[PDB]
Amino acid sequence: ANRMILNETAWFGRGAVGALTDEVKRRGYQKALIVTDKTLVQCGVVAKVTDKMDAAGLAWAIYDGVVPNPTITVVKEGLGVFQNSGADYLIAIGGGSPQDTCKAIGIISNNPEFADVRSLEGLSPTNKPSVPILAIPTTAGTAAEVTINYVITDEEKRRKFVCVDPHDIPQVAFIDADMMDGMPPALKAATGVDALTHAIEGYITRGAWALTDALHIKAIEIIAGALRGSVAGDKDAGEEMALGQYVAGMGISNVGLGLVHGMAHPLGAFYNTPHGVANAILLPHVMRYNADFTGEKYRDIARVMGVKVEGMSLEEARNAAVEAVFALNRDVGIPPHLRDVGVRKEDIPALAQAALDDVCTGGNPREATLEDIVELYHTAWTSH
Amino acid sequence: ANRMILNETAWFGRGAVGALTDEVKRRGYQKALIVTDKTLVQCGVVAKVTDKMDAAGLAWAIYDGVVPNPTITVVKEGLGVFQNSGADYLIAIGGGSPQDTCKAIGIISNNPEFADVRSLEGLSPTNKPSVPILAIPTTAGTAAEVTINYVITDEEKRRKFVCVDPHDIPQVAFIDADMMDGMPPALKAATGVDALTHAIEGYITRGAWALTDALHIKAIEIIAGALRGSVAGDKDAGEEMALGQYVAGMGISNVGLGLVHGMAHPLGAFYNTPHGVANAILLPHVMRYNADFTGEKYRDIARVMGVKVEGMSLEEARNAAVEAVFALNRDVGIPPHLRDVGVRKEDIPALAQAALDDVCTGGNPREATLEDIVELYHTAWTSH
Numbered sequence: 001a002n003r004m005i006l007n008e009t010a011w012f013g014r015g016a017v018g019a020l021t022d023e024v025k026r027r028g029y030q031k032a033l034i035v036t037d038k039t040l041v042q043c044g045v046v047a048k049v050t051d052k053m054d055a056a057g058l059a060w061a062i063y064d065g066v067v068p069n070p071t072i073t074v075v076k077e078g079l080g081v082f083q084n085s086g087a088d089y090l091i092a093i094g095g096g097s098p099q100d101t102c103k104a105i106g107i108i109s110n111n112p113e114f115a116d117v118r119s120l121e122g123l124s125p126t127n128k129p130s131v132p133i134l135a136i137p138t139t140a141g142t143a144a145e146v147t148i149n150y151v152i153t154d155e156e157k158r159r160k161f162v163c164v165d166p167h168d169i170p171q172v173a174f175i176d177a178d179m180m181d182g183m184p185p186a187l188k189a190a191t192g193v194d195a196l197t198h199a200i201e202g203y204i205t206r207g208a209w210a211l212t213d214a215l216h217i218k219a220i221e222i223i224a225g226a227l228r229g230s231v232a233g234d235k236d237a238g239e240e241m242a243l244g245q246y247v248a249g250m251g252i253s254n255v256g257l258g259l260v261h262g263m264a265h266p267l268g269a270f271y272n273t274p275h276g277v278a279n280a281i282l283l284p285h286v287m288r289y290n291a292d293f294t295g296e297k298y299r300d301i302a303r304v305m306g307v308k309v310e311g312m313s314l315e316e317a318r319n320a321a322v323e324a325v326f327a328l329n330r331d332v333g334i335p336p337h338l339r340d341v342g343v344r345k346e347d348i349p350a351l352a353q354a355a356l357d358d359v360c361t362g363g364n365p366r367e368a369t370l371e372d373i374v375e376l377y378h379t380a381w382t383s384h
Numbered sequence: 385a386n387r388m389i390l391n392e393t394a395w396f397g398r399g400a401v402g403a404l405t406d407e408v409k410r411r412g413y414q415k416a417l418i419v420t421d422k423t424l425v426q427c428g429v430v431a432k433v434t435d436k437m438d439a440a441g442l443a444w445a446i447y448d449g450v451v452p453n454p455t456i457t458v459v460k461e462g463l464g465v466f467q468n469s470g471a472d473y474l475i476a477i478g479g480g481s482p483q484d485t486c487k488a489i490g491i492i493s494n495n496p497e498f499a500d501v502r503s504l505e506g507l508s509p510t511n512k513p514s515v516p517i518l519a520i521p522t523t524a525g526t527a528a529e530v531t532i533n534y535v536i537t538d539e540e541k542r543r544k545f546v547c548v549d550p551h552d553i554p555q556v557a558f559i560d561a562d563m564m565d566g567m568p569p570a571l572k573a574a575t576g577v578d579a580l581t582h583a584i585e586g587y588i589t590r591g592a593w594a595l596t597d598a599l600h601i602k603a604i605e606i607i608a609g610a611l612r613g614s615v616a617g618d619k620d621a622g623e624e625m626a627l628g629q630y631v632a633g634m635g636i637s638n639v640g641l642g643l644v645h646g647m648a649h650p651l652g653a654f655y656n657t658p659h660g661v662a663n664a665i666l667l668p669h670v671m672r673y674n675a676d677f678t679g680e681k682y683r684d685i686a687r688v689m690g691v692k693v694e695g696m697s698l699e700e701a702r703n704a705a706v707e708a709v710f711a712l713n714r715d716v717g718i719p720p721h722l723r724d725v726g727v728r729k730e731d732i733p734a735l736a737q738a739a740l741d742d743v744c745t746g747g748n749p750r751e752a753t754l755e756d757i758v759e760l761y762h763t764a765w766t767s768h
């Protein structure tokens with residue numbers, strides 16, 4: 001049988017964060033710790049929520065120390081602020097980095113033996129649910145609000161590790177494009193192709209089944225239809241992206257991903273490469289590698305990305321799907337090569353071993369070898 | 385903004401009830417009350433679960449007093465059995481009648497001021513979550529495992545009332561076609577068209593939006609593809625129906641239904657008409673009434689029900705969608721007219737007023753008048 005874990009409650013649309021004060025009152029919570037980053041404070045995104053909490057008389061404290069690719073140090077620091085805050089629940093405001101930090105803090109607070117953080121890797125053997133989390137994404141996005149995963153950087157071991165735990169699922173997600181509009185265009189582009197990567201990898205993952213296929217192919221259609229417009233500042237395209245990125249995540253931890261996420265993680269660990277950019281650059285190269293092991297599915301991807309697939313051979317349809325992703329990447333300004341974002345050719349074998357061992361790689365529809373992954377990093381790296 | 389309430393956890397596929405004992409152990413529950421009916425006990429469906437609970441050392445008691453269109457008496461009796469059982473959680477085994485009884489018992493147990501049952505009608509202002517519910521459907525089906533609705537019969541007032549409450553959502557749903565295979569063919573047919581009715585009414589309801597549209601049109605495709613095969617005894621078609629009926633419900637408590645459910649409820653109240661049969665007979669007539677208020681949506685319905693819509697006008701595609709439902713109803717043996725199932729012509733004005741006032745009718749895409757509903761009952765009552 002197949003398990004699906006989802007948010008019990010989610011609010012969607014512009015103004016969805018307007019539901020937060022009523023949700024808090026209905027659940028009887030007394031005081032939030034907001035887990036966020038300095039950019040979202042500076043840009044006034046956090047205040048979109050705290051102004052509503054202030055108006056409703058709801059108490060809050062803030063931890064804004066999160067950094068991209070959040071580290072063991074960031075988790076321990078946030079946990080310290082949580083323990084001293086008197087908060088009884090968490091509000092995660094931000095992209096995957098704050099949402100994942102918030103999950104780690106919530107889990108460790110109710111499972112204090114995991115305070116070393118390393119011990120959470122894999123199927124975390126936690127006995128207690130997380131401190132309740134209300135999740136408010138500000139990128140479009142990682143869908144960290146709806147997965148049971150969170151990804152922490154071990155700086156000493158130079159690796160990103162995935163923690164998988166039904167105990168971390170947020171109680172309520174608020175998916176509000178008003179919270180996302182202020183992303184710089186390059187951040188809309190990269191988080192949007194990360195969303196597309198979740199949807200494509202989820203569509204073709206070894207564990208795929210009927211329900212996740214239906215969700216993923218709809219997410220691909222929405223994201224491919226909306227991302228150019230959203231990057232360009234179209235308000236309705238932004239609302240479409242907010243929905244598409246969420247639907248794209250409804251399979252990440254229910255069925256799995258593949259070698260794109262497997263190869264993106266070591267770039268985050270080695271260089272602090274932004275997750276979205278890493279996935280975007282890799283995606284079409286990994287799609288080419290996987291193409292002949294994905295049945296009819298690239299014909300479906302090409303069709304919903306606007307390709308006229310009528311009369312194409314399966315290989316022509318596969319080539320068209322890959323080309324549609326290369327074209328979208330160019331069209332929203334994704335750097336074309338890993339050399340452009342400071343990846344070092346001499347690191348490729350170490351990156352490839354880290355990718356081969358990444359849990360995401362296990363879902364890949366083509367069984368990857370070390371040599372295959374080395375060649376893929378070279379293909380993605382090269383100016384030629 | 386649009387709210388989605390879903391099961392936090394759901395297991396899908398033949399053998400999904402095999403997950404139940406581990407879910408109970410992980411949640412630390414001590415003793416179940418199983419809420420079911422005498423038929424499911426007698427035919428050994430309940431033992432499929434209790435044999436597994438016995439093997440795992442999990443305590444249970446049973447209330448099997450549920451009858452179709454469960455009444456205030458059934459709820460009060462089951463509440464009494466629950467209170468005396470020492471159970472700390474509920475397991476609902478059955479179709480909508482046991483699932484809805486279980487929701488009422490769980491809500492009242494934690495919100496004892498609603499012990500009159502009538503007071504639960506509408507948006508129940510309960511302060512506390514239900515006693516935890518694990519939901520196991522045996523029909524395909526009402527999707528009562530995933531909606532926030534439950535429907536109780538007031539025998540004294542001769543009316544069915546709808547209770548809508550986020551607090552009643554089951555913690556875990558187990559969607560297992562092994563639990564459904566014993567439905568007689570006529571029961572597969574009627575519960576299957578009830579599922580189709582959820583999916584069609586949910587697709588065209590006033591509150592419809594992008595996510596529920598995606599779920600409902602996929603549910604229509606699955607159900608229209610599988611129902612004839614499932615009624616004929618095909619095991620794989622039965623598993624398809626188990627998924628389709630669930631997806632059909634993911635939309636409905638989140639966006640609403642329409643006049644088919646509004647007109648079906650008074651038939652259940654007046655005559656004890658089976659819910660699925662009532663919906664099936666009404667569905668194509670109400671679809672014809674609603675057709676010109678549904679934009680392009682009947683072209684989508686006709687297409688996924690196997691109609692070649694290429695080259696049809698929208699009005700031709702609307703007619704084709706209605707005809708596809710008439711054809712399905714004939715093919716799975718739904719009685720063609722309300723007179724066939726003991727509906728009295730002289731009751732039509734009283735039925736019509738009850739339907740006009742039913743909360744489901746408020747979602748109908750065409751604003752219904754008393755006169756319109758009277759005419760629709762007449763159209764459905766005999767051949768013209």
Ligand SMILES: NC(=O)c1ccc[n+]([C@@H]2O[C@H](COP(=O)([O-])OP(=O)(O)OC[C@H]3O[C@@H](n4cnc5c(N)ncnc54)[C@H](O)[C@@H]3O)[C@@H](O)[C@H]2O)c1
Binds near residue numbers: 039098148275
């Ligand atoms: N299942 C999961 O939990 C899951 C899924 C995939 C990714 N991840 C993790 O998510 C992280 C990446 O998250 P991300 O891609 O959302 O980026 P991020 O959270 O790392 O943020 C990237 C940058 O964008 C800024 N930013 C975010 N929202 C903004 C806004 N609205 N306006 C202005 N600036 C804004 C941040 O301040 C930061 O500088 C990685 O660590 C990745 O491994 C986890």
Ligand SMILES: NC(=O)c1ccc[n+]([C@@H]2O[C@H](COP(=O)([O-])OP(=O)(O)OC[C@H]3O[C@@H](n4cnc5c(N)ncnc54)[C@H](O)[C@@H]3O)[C@@H](O)[C@H]2O)c1
Binds near residue numbers: 483535565
């Ligand atoms: N909760 C909601 O959102 C919701 C939605 C729709 C319908 N409903 C309600 O659900 C009820 C109808 O439920 P239903 O249509 O599932 O039927 P049901 O639960 O009333 O059962 C009908 C008959 O089928 C039998 N049966 C059920 N499963 C069987 C199996 N596997 N093998 C053999 N016999 C089996 C029952 O014992 C009974 O005799 C109505 O009261 C309706 O109002 C509620």
Ligand SMILES: [Fe+3]
Binds near residue numbers: 261
């Ligand atoms: Fe990602």
Ligand SMILES: [Fe+3]
Binds near residue numbers: 526578581582645659
């Ligand atoms: Fe129904």
